[PDB]
Scaffold this active site. Sequence first.
Site, PDB file in Angstrom:
ATOM      1  N   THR B   1      47.125  -0.269  46.083  1.00 50.09           N
ATOM      2  CA  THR B   1      47.572  -1.122  47.223  1.00 50.09           C
ATOM      3  C   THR B   1      48.885  -1.826  46.894  1.00 50.09           C
ATOM      4  OG1 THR B   1      45.309  -1.523  48.029  1.00 50.09           O
ATOM      5  CG2 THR B   1      46.990  -3.105  48.700  1.00 50.09           C
ATOM      6  N   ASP B  17      50.878  -1.324  52.654  1.00 49.28           N
ATOM      7  CA  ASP B  17      50.797   0.125  52.737  1.00 49.28           C
ATOM      8  C   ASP B  17      49.471   0.479  53.405  1.00 49.28           C
ATOM      9  OD1 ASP B  17      49.241  -0.525  50.313  1.00 49.28           O
ATOM     10  OD2 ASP B  17      49.172   1.659  50.036  1.00 49.28           O
ATOM     11  N   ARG B  19      47.188   3.256  52.130  1.00 47.93           N
ATOM     12  CA  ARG B  19      46.344   4.142  51.331  1.00 47.93           C
ATOM     13  C   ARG B  19      45.113   3.410  50.810  1.00 47.93           C
ATOM     14  NH1 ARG B  19      48.945   7.553  46.460  1.00 47.93           N
ATOM     15  NH2 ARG B  19      49.560   8.886  48.225  1.00 47.93           N
ATOM     16  N   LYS B  33      45.328  -2.821  56.206  1.00 46.34           N
ATOM     17  CA  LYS B  33      45.175  -3.856  55.182  1.00 46.34           C
ATOM     18  C   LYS B  33      45.625  -5.222  55.671  1.00 46.34           C
ATOM     19  CE  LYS B  33      45.773  -0.419  51.661  1.00 46.34           C
ATOM     20  NZ  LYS B  33      46.379  -0.064  50.358  1.00 46.34           N
ATOM     21  N   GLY B  47      42.703  -5.221  46.502  1.00 47.32           N
ATOM     22  CA  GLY B  47      41.539  -5.320  45.626  1.00 47.32           C
ATOM     23  C   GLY B  47      40.383  -4.511  46.177  1.00 47.32           C
ATOM     24  N   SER B 129      48.306  -3.131  43.054  1.00 49.07           N
ATOM     25  CA  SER B 129      48.735  -2.234  41.976  1.00 49.07           C
ATOM     26  C   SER B 129      50.229  -1.922  42.038  1.00 49.07           C
ATOM     27  CB  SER B 129      47.946  -0.925  42.018  1.00 49.07           C
ATOM     28  OG  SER B 129      48.049  -0.315  43.293  1.00 49.07           O
ATOM     29  N   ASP B 166      54.285   3.806  42.946  1.00 42.90           N
ATOM     30  CA  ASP B 166      52.898   3.526  42.561  1.00 42.90           C
ATOM     31  C   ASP B 166      51.939   4.550  43.166  1.00 42.90           C
ATOM     32  OD1 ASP B 166      50.606   2.163  41.535  1.00 42.90           O
ATOM     33  OD2 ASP B 166      50.352   1.194  43.489  1.00 42.90           O
ATOM     34  N   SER B 169      49.325   3.335  45.808  1.00 44.49           N
ATOM     35  CA  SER B 169      49.868   2.989  47.110  1.00 44.49           C
ATOM     36  C   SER B 169      50.494   4.221  47.737  1.00 44.49           C
ATOM     37  CB  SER B 169      50.919   1.896  46.953  1.00 44.49           C
ATOM     38  OG  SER B 169      50.406   0.822  46.184  1.00 44.49           O
TER      39      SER B 169
HETATM   40 MG   LIG Z   1      49.826  12.545  46.213  1.00 45.07          MG
END
Ligand SMILES: [Mg+2]
EC number: 3.4.25.1
Lengths: 233, 222, 250, 191, 204, 212, 195, 195, 222
Positions: B1, B17, B19, B33, B47, B129, B166, B169
Amino acid sequence: TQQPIVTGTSVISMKYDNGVIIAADNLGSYGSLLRFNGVERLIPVGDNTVVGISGDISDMQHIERLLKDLVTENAYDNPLADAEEALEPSYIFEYLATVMYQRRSKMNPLWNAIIVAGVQSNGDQFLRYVNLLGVTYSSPTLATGFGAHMANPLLRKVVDRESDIPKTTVQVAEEAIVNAMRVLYYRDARSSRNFSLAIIDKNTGLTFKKNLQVENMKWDFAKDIKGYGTQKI
Amino acid sequence: TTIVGVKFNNGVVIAADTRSTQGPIVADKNCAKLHRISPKIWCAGAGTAADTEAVTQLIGSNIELHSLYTSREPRVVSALQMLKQHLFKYQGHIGAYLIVAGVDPTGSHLFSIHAHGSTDVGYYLSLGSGSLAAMAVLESHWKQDLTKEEAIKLASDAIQAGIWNDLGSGSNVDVCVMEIGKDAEYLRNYLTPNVREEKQKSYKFPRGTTAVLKESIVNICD
Amino acid sequence: MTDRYSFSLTTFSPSGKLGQIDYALTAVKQGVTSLGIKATNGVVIATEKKSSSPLAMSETLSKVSLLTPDIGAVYSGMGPDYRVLVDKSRKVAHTSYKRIYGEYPPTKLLVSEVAKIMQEATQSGGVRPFGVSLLIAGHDEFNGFSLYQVDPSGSYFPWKATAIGKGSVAAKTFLEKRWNDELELEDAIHIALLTLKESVEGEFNGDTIELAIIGDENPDLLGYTGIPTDKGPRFRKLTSQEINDRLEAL
Amino acid sequence: LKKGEVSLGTSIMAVTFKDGVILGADSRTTTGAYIANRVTDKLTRVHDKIWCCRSGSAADTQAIADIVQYHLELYTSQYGTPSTETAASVFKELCYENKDNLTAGIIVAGYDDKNKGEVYTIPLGGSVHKLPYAINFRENMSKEETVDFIKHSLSQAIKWDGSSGGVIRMVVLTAAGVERLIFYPDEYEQL
Amino acid sequence: SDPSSINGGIVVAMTGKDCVAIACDLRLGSQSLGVSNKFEKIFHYGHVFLGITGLATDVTTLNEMFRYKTNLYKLKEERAIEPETFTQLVSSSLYERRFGPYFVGPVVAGINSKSGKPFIAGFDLIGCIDEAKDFIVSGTASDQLFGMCESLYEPNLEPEDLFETISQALLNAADRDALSGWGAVVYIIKKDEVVKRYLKMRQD
Amino acid sequence: TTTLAFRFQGGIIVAVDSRATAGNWVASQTVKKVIEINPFLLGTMAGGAADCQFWETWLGSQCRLHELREKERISVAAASKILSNLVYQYKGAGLSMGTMICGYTRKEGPTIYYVDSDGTRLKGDIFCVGSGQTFAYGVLDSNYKWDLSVEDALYLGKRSILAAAHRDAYSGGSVNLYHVTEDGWIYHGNHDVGELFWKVKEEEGSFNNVIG
Amino acid sequence: MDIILGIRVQDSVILASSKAVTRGISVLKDSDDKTRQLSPHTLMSFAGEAGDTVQFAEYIQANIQLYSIREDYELSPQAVSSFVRQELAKSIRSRRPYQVNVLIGGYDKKKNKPELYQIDYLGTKVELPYGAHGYSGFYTFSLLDHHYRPDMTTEEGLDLLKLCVQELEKRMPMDFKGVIVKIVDKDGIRQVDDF
Amino acid sequence: MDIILGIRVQDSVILASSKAVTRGISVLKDSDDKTRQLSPHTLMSFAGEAGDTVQFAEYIQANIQLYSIREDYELSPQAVSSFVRQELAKSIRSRRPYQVNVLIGGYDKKKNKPELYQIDYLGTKVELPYGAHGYSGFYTFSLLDHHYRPDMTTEEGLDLLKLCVQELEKRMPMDFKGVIVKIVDKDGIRQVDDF
Amino acid sequence: QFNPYGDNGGTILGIAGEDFAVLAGDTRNITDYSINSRYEPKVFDCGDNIVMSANGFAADGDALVKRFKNSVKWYHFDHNDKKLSINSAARNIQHLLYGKRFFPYYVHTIIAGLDEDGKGAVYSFDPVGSYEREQCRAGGAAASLIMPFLDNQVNFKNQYEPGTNGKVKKPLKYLSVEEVIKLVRDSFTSATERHIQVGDGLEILIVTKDGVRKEFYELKRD
Ligand SMILES: [Mg+2]
Ligand SMILES: [Cl-]
Ligand SMILES: [Mg+2]
Ligand SMILES: [Mg+2]
Ligand SMILES: [Mg+2]
């Protein structure tokens, strides 16, 4: 099996149109203590390579000696030691990468993360990483430790892929590096304001800059910040 | 995240984001989110996904009831306080890392809350992250006296830094802008830079491919 | 110390009457007239703002209350009892429904929960019944518009239109003549103002009359944009100015 | 200290002087080697002229400070303005009784008109210690001397400790009122 | 000793054009030992369908629970529950046991009787809702299903085509999972008719 | 994994499954679990794949060197013992092996030795090794006779693996059959379990619990 | 407590349960009846942790017997098995769970059908034609899968059961001292004394 | 590997050894001979860790057979037992010790006396009238203490041995699939085929 | 304590045709949630028309490939420049891998080429040297996602002939190099969507009697 004692943090680097840049701060930390402030973690090998090392400092000083002894040994019975049969970055890298993997395979590693930055005899840029596990990889931008998390994202905005390298100048590359080093000073607890920077250009050669400082920082906005939520005064 | 929050002239903006991971597996490629606590108080959460939603809805519920009781528009400090006290009570076991932002009669506010119950104040914040990738961008480009359009750019750039760099994310960028004297505008999928390319082949099967043993009609009616 | 009243204060008399409920209804009778009218595309609820003193600010005292974005309530009888019922009604809409189903309860079920609270005050230990009758207007997707009355006993009845309090007998007669099943919302508001003028004695204007509607969704009152499914509250309290506009063409 | 939670370091001090008392601190907050906040305000108000310096767990110290502020607000409503000693007692009572679950090191500093400047330190165990100063000092220093004493002291802590850094915040407590001071890296580093 | 992978099993749900589909394998085992080839993991409460993977005792328990809760919902609301509402009920009920969770991976599927819109949703064991346009996967072969669904799936499939796609996603995923298989069932759900087909697959 | 091998009137039957798993993930369904040591000797794979492959191939090299030096076919006893003595040297190091060394010679007749990575070497008539060994033993024990025909014996070995493949999650894919005679071994094909199951169900009337 | 088997045939359910009770290095008893009659046409066999097994079985027995008196009516095997499952399902999240696995063999008088239910200690219920608990399934399921037919008689079921016991006696490491066999049918529950 | 017994009577030594070889949940073999002939009048039975048992036994066998050829002479049971003990005594302090317990039954031709030696894996040697290894002594020692007499015949010893096996079969948890019995006397070593 | 192993992510794929063979692999190299390189090749031409990849822990993969390449070199010296057959290389790699049985190379190895009859061959190895020839094999992080798809499309598993009551299977047949590359590309784009360690780029090495050809394709960078 070891455990590192006095350590060095991030080493960041990137390729540009004619060469490579590499930088690393002048600090040797001891857990949380900023003990040694005169530590040079960039080591030039000849006039075409610079090895940047992070991790255990005593293991770094061992590697310094190996490279120094490598230059001596290469000059033995070699009339072309300052020309055709001079040391290349790719030779120096493969040597270290061999050593690092041998040491981890003996379960007695050199607790380091290394970046060999240089320019080959044919003008090609060299930039490759190797660590205590013997793991190697190459990229337009390379960084160790924190640099991997905070610097790489910034440097990849400049050189997001191979085709962006010829479009990137030394002035732009140096600016990105110096900016990245400031960001690491803000956010890495194991970093220092003082640092060293090296440029290996295929035309102008090796330029080594010592005693640099992070500057043009933003701290003024801190005065407006009060408490942790409800506090007005 | 990767979630961020940026203060500007007449308000505050938060972004995230989309994901949602399950180890190395991407469970949801377009998850939300950004949470609504009150109409003009929004919360970005990183988290443990179930915890960020459950805690933001509970406090949002109690904020709505409080707003009705007091005949006043809710404040961000009220949400902030109710959240941190709940999180602190559970000693970090509710893995909710939040960025709370909004506008109220007092002004525009931006806070962060950690799972353990610590709060921070700032002009620019990032959590998750991809918080280091995002903060690198924020520390490079942030300045005092940003405009609405400058702040949305900075925010979505910071989230992009996380998407690309990242692995936790990815996908799209969500934004919510809370300006003073205005309705808060929720920009779902503000950016969609990860659109899947056309497949090389259609894997639509000829009918009857699948072998079948039995067939029966299910009765859903009474 | 401690609450020793663990026994019922409401009990059956020899005739079968539940005295305290009857006496609570008597208190509702003394209360100020309030009414509700159901239209095809909305519901209207209204009441007189009986000011205790001219120095008092009648704006601060709200007889008509929002329970959910799509449900509103008005009363006749004891104001303080109403106020706490509204607090409990709002909370129960969340705890026993919204926190479970992620959506606001339909009118009939919220009414059911309020009725339950009022029934308990009729049977539980050491308490008197609530001295109020509620009129709850609301809308929900599957039941559409609806209007309910709730009495001190906890009994509730759905109404097309009704009145409670001081002049409810005459007001209900008036509504019987005027009400039909083809009424539009604006027509119901008009009838509501006519019906209420009969029971009101003193001043009759937007400052002495409180009136709200359950009608179309109000995106402007939502407070945010970006979610298409969230279109805004159907409950809207008419302003003092909005009432006076309709009193001119009366 | 719980794993991964936000740490407040330990570079905080309070010094009593002629006109009152001064609290001082850095602004760094960590999660491992990562600086979570570089402009933290570790100087927190529990009452008009009673402040504290927080160290250890940020979550724990915030929760406590919030509770103390609650108790002193309620005290003031009933019994009038409380003493700095009273404030320290409430802190201790919390830190001592919940010592198993907390990691909070607190310095309480305040200004009375009778007692003047007072400083109380409350370490991990939940003990209280009244002192002239807390973290070559002279009693009854001037404001300007005490500022330089805190500035020079924290400057060195930042120099050698990685858990410390950023700006140096200071709060001055006197009969005059409350004054906030701040000192940036370019100033204190080259001392 | 991992509750989500003792009994084994899988569930997958897909959307189509004015239709949804939900399918499950039929295996129940005790680790390596196969115990039942008739253990269906899909249930329905009115016109809302629920598939549940994970620990079998919790699968059985949650079905009995949502039967309980939907039956009371219907008596009070005087109407059958819709998929969007039921999804929130499942999330609520799961997070109620946040620190002592049911070891399950539920999947909701159905069509809204009012709007006619197809709806599918998935949850983690503590009730995080994963709403999706395309497909939802759950079970011990969820990785496998993610790979099959992501490549095979295409939007706006007709009931007869969607059947083949979801059937092939399930079958080939289950064959690369030791704890899934031993039979399969696919529910094809239209606005006012539902067909249930048992698939023929390898029994190893 | 399910592997069985039994002695009978007409020699030895060897039957194995084909499945390989890494946790719950099925890595392969096409694994060769019978190692062709030489034209006269077979070995089964169970435990460690590499350990069984590597050392039973190595065994074939030792068997070739024996017959070159001694000008005579190596006995099953001697061949098995070369392997068991080797793994005993490595005992403690972590080898994982459970195998049947099968052969048919003049002096011995049909012979089977169970060899195992903790040093065990057992001669016997019927052996079953693997996660699905118990299922296979059941079918074998109840239907085994010495005077079985080669046709019936091959089916018994095939049917026993199928029984395991059905119940044991970690067994399946396909069945490989072998018949070991004095003149060498004969391969009797690869049989997909998916197709084989339905075929056996219909013809035999077994597996009524399963709908087909 | 080790071996419990169950076979549902055409007109009856047959339960077979081992007689051995072992503690440490000694077999303390070789005639133990690991079953309780829950109702005239419902029988439950059990195996698992020492103490828990009998305590659970008798607790269930009492509850079903209480129901029978209260309603003057026998609960169906399906109803009994659901009740039992729920109790084990409650148990697994308790402070100290019942570690007991059970088989419930019953004859439904309304349906005129025999029924066999397998329930483990987690509360995992399954209706089966044949069932087992512990390692028992690992040596008998292949034999039952092969020879079992759904239209078998009680006598054919007993021969099928003998085949399983023989295989267990041959390949099982532990001596379980044979089995007690009981038959559940329309006429109720009876014990086969010679097995 | 589990049960090995030994009884020295007037004119012979009788060794009884279980036939079962178990691995995990399966009895792999039920006809295993857990003994090796070291010399014409010396027999060693063994039990312990898998692999080690046979490897050790055969290693001893080879060494005693080598001695026999070299000297054209049979080593006395006492001499053989001392050699065996020393090898186990070396073993226990090795990198990986032989985990093997043995009984050495022999007939000394010079003394005209039968001899039974019990040696455990540590190299603990004892000469006994009757012996056992593992948990086998726990059920039989009380019977031999009671019923054993030093002047018994071979036939009386076999009846005494039958009594031990019966007691083990009754009270031991594990099925050890009976025993192979061997007799060592002046005429050498022979096996009792029907037991 | 020092852990000598690591996971560098990535996933590889080897498919065998009638007169050709392909070995594909993504070019992303990762550690934890960071990206090390977006283009770091791990499929190599080792000579004698053999291509090789050792996926998993990169340091062990690079060492193994380096040793095998050297094994090919010495095979020529010692055996009069004889060509190393794919089956001989497979057996050689088994010995390289098993030689470290008690301190393994943490890699899943796949090689591809042509057999001695000119037909396509793919060999897969476990970390300690067990090997098997196959038509189709995926290896690495997203092998679980890709492999069941290949079973369905390459080997036509679970697909029955329409109208035959699921009695007649769909017949096996060799695919063209063009059809294979489609399946490879679609395998990797699908894996890229649902696996965080898979992305950036895709490099395919095709092997025919003419030699070794390369093909590169971009993948999503999130
Ligand atoms: Mg990928
Ligand atoms: Cl803080
Ligand atoms: Mg510092
Ligand atoms: Mg399977
Ligand atoms: Mg299977």
